[PDB]
From a paper:
[name] is a homodimeric copper-containing and zinc-containing enzyme, serving as one of the cellular protective mechanisms against reactive oxygen species. An alanine-to-valine mutation at amino acid position 4 within the [name] protein ([name]), accounting for 50% of [name]-related gene mutations in the US, causes a rapid and aggressive form of fALS, thereby reducing survival time to less than 2 years. While the mechanism of dimer destabilisation and the increased propensity to aggregate remain elusive, several structural and molecular dynamics studies have demonstrated that the [name] mutation causes structural changes in neighbouring residues close to the dimer interface, which potentially perturb overall dimer stability even though the interface interactions are generally conserved in the crystal structure. On the other hand, several studies have shown that Cys111 could be a potential target for the development of compounds to stabilise [name].
To exclude the effect of differences imposed by crystal packing, the crystal structure of [name] [name] in C2 form was used to compare monomer-monomer orientation. All dimers in the asymmetric unit (ASU) of each structure were overlaid onto one dimer of the [name] [name] structure without ligands. The major difference is in loop VI, residues 109–114, which is more open in the compound-bound [name] structures with some variations among structures and an asymmetry of this loop between two monomers. The result suggests that loop VI is slightly displaced upon ligand binding. Binding of the ligands to [name] [name] does not seem to affect hydrogen bonding and hydrophobic interactions between two monomers of the dimer or the distances between residues at the dimer interface except the distances between loop VI when comparing to the C2 [name] [name] structure. We note there is a structural variability across [name] [name] structures which is not eliminated by crystallisation and whether the subtle changes in the compound-bound [name] [name] structures are related to the dimer stability requires further investigation.
Numbering used by the authors:
A (entry chain C), B (entry chain A): 1 to 153
Write the structure that this text describes.
């Protein structure tokens, strides 16, 4: 198996730890952990292209998109590789994350190791917002916290 | 050409940005940048195994050592893959870093992408201190700042 981890930090109070694990190459990736300090409700949750934190979350670049598609939800055929949809923060501002995704990988030429996981200010509209911003970012707004995706024990 | 970047942060005042670039998969890696907030003199400078910041720099684990060798300087035949030796901080606490290393790689089975770069409290004795600690860590002492090695534009 490949096991990786991401520590999410930003300019504000949002912080979290997200685990990724893949049992076999181009097999499904389990993504799980916890994020705290989020406003109650849905938050966009994406892998961005660059593991570059030189200008905070801004230098991570756009959603990881090596197949040059439009933004969508994780269940859509038309999506970015990095499109993991939303996570849900409870009334205490805690998002318990548990996702299974078959498009991201921890191996091969489109591997997300050394890229950036970002949790966003607002809900990802999954490309259903009726504008160019919807088909690029899902209107998920600002980057609250991010981390570079790193190899774990 | 693979280009990667590492933002070094820690508990205290030490911070920096280190770039890595490799033209070909066989080839040397250029390592360069700047670290500030250091004591004047030599500081151990190592790639550690895990890109895991869950318990700060401690969760990075030991020096990256896929060939199960003893600690050395970068020029020693016996070294860890992660053994990049010392960087030098000037009297203002700034280390200008410029290293070329042919043992680390930014691709292949022993890639350092998603691993951790650490700058240490004291000088690396390059595995020549005549104790067990020398053969593991070079007696470079505590981890002042670290970052996950990420993909850059
Ligand atoms: Zn997207
Ligand atoms: Zn070593």
């Amino acid at each position: 198996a490949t096991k990786v981890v991401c520590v999410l930090k930003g300019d504000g109070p949002v912080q979290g730890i997200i685990n990724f694990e893949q049992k076999e190459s181009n097999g499904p990736v389990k993504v799980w952990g916890s994020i705290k300090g989020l406003t109650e409700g849905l938050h966009g949750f994406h892998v961005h292209e660059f593991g570059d934190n030189t200008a905070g979350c801004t230098s991570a670049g756009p959603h990881f998109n090596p197949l040059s598609r439009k933004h969508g939800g994780p269940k859509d055929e038309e999506r970015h590789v990095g499109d993991l949809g939303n996570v849900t923060a409870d009334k205490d501002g805690v998002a318990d994350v548990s996702i299974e995704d078959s498009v991201i990988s921890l191996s091969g030429d489109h591997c997300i190791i050394g890229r950036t996981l970002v949790v966003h200010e607002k809900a990802d509209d999954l490309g259903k917002g009726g504008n160019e911003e919807s088909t690029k970012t899902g209107n998920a707004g600002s980057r609250l916290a991010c981390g570079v995706i790193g190899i774990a024990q």
